[PDB]
């Protein structure tokens, strides 16, 4: 009976520790994915805007080439 009483108390302690552990890890991994995902959405949008700045400058060089004739 005494081995079993310790068994039970230690199992209660273990289930509470595992509950804390999984919440801790699930939260951590969700913050991580969101950081990556949001930063990538912004990088994509900004990468696109610069690709337009590239085209504008090419539109300026294009104007001078025709400007010498």
């Amino acid at each position: 009976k005494r081995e079993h009483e310790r068994e039970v108390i230690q199992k209660a302690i273990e289930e509470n520790n595992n509950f804390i552990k999984m919440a801790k890890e699930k939260l951590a991994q969700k913050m991580e994915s969101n950081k990556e995902n949001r930063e990538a959405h912004l990088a994509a949008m900004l990468e696109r805007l610069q690709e337009k700045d590239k085209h504008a400058e090419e539109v300026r060089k294009n104007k001078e080439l025709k400007e010498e004739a």
Partner: protein, 440 residues
């Protein structure tokens, strides 16, 4: 000992907390500056109201509460209202930019910038307790902060306080007062994320409350002020077990044992009676029999559903005021026969009954008549699943076309979190189906 810490989150959570703490002060005789002339033990004491109020050396009784919101205008009203002297400035925490009705902003983009500070203020309150019982969390389903930040807070509280119990008071969305088209999304996301972190959640359907105010109080176009005052009476009834003591008073934890037969099935349906105006109550003394009967009227439920079409797993009646056991016995005897109350076959004892002798009180200028006796019923019925069904249908209509989803994805969320949340809801609806089926 047995202290309770209250956490009020977002607009609805904050404004309902304001209604509750004003009602508590009236009930205990605490003045707007925190003085309580009735209290003889100065500096401390182990009295019943001490579960909700700490005391300072100067005799101030301070709510064990945190108000948190991602923008300031709502809490600013607390900082400058009638009870501004009741709270320490650090118990009121505000950001500069709210969640924009977007769960993703509340759980992640904005919430992550204030979460540590909030958990810190909470620790400071917990450290003042000698036997902390748990947390009461007030929030809307629909707001960006009520949904997203509340989820983050709850996950964090599990990590920092383990199995310590957390009870929710949640506002379920209704189109008559809804502020956002995407509230079904935020509602399913927060309910999914919170299900395994909450021990017991009391849902209040804004449409149910809206209708009761229109029909029973004669208010043609109810406001949040009307709704919150009524809500606070329900909240006061549930916590009255902890703030007062009586020979027939029964503790809320004893109700919880009866109310939660399985972890996921932790959503009691609340009713309250009498809800009546001064004009109608002037010539009408409502008996224990009448107010008890009203608890079983479908139209008096705090969530729109039909318990006649479901099965009960528990009924807890919380009487208060001028009530004696003999009258309760006769009232329930009547209800058992004149009504069709069907209990599941696995619950031997379906009724649990207590009396708190503290009479109901009302705020001056409110819409509720002052009555000698009142009753709050908490029942666990499968019928509450109808509320999940209605939400899930609105979710499915929008999600089938991915309407509005780019707002959440743009903030860092994945679609998988949506369908994961929705599948969890599907299991919940099924769980309510299986508990109701008779035993082999």
């Amino acid at each position: 000992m047995r202290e309770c810490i209250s956490i009020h989150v977002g607009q609805a959570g904050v404004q309902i907390g304001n209604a509750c703490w004003e009602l508590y002060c009236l009930e205990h005789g605490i003045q707007p500056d925190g003085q309580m002339p009735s209290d003889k033990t100065i500096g401390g004491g182990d009295d019943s109201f001490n579960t909700f109020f700490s005391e300072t050396g100067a005799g101030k009784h301070v709510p064990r509460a945190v108000f948190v919101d991602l923008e300031p205008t709502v809490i600013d009203e607390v900082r400058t209202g009638t009870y501004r002297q009741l709270f320490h400035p650090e118990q009121l925490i505000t950001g500069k930019e709210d969640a924009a009705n977007n769960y993703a902003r509340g759980h992640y983009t904005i919430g992550k910038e204030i979460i540590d500070l909030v958990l810190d203020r909470i620790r400071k309150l917990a450290d003042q307790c000698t036997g902390l019982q748990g947390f009461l969390v007030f929030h809307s389903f629909g707001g960006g902060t009520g949904s997203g930040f509340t989820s983050l807070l709850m996950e964090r509280l599990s990590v920092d306080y383990g199995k310590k119990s957390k009870l929710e008071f949640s506002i379920y969305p209704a189109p008559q007062v809804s502020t956002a088209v995407v509230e079904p999304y935020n509602s399913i996301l927060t309910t999914h994320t919170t299900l395994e972190h909450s021990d017991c959640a009391f849902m209040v359907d804004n449409e149910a409350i809206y209708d009761i105010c229109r029909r029973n109080l004669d208010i043609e176009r109810p406001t949040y002020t009307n709704l919150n005052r009524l809500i606070s009476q329900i909240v006061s009834s549930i916590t009255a077990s902890l703030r007062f003591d009586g020979a027939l008073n029964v503790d809320l934890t004893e109700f919880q044992t009866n109310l939660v037969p399985y972890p996921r099935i932790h959503f009691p349906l609340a009713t309250y009676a009498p809800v009546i105006s001064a004009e109608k109550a002037y010539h009408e003394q409502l008996s224990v029999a009448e107010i008890t009967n009203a608890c079983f009227e479908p139209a008096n439920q705090m969530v729109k559903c039909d318990p006649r079409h479901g099965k009960y797993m528990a009924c807890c009646l919380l009487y208060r005021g001028d009530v004696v056991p003999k009258d309760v016995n006769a009232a329930i005897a009547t209800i058992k026969t004149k009504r069709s109350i069907q209990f599941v076959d696995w619950c031997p004892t379906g009724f649990k009954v207590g009396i708190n002798y503290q009479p109901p009180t009302v705020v001056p200028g409110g819409d509720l008549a002052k009555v000698q006796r009142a009753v709050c019923m908490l029942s666990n019925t499968t019928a509450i699943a109808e509320a999940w069904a209605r939400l899930d249908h609105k979710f499915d209509l929008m999600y089938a076309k991915r309407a509005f989803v780019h707002w959440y994805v743009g903030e860092g969320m994945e679609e998988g979190e949506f369908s994961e949340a929705r599948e969890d809801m599907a299991a919940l609806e099924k769980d309510y189906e299986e508990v109701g089926v008779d035993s082999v």
